[PDB]
């Protein structure tokens with residue numbers, strides 16, 4: 253399957269739509285498609301690539317940084333997250349964790 257992923261940058265009021273395979277991490281697909289997103293560790297152990305789900309679901313089992321509460325709240329580490337449905341997500345939410 254291939255999922256539709258809507259990337260929203262609230263502070264800049266930008267919107268980008270990409271298509272991501274169900275076996276590809278969101279970050280990678282975004283870059284391939286011409287949209288550079290923030291990252292650091294690229295390994296699910298940091299907050300740099302954090303986003304916030306608006307709608308849809310993802311699989312981020314490879315993540316280690318977020319706690320249960322933050323996940324329930326909708327936070328996602330885009331560097332290690334695979335879409336599991338069409339998704340709408342707010343990017344650049346790193347500073348929401350401090």
Ligand code: FES
Nearest residue numbers: 294296297298331
């Ligand atoms: S860049 Fe560190 S968890 Fe994604």
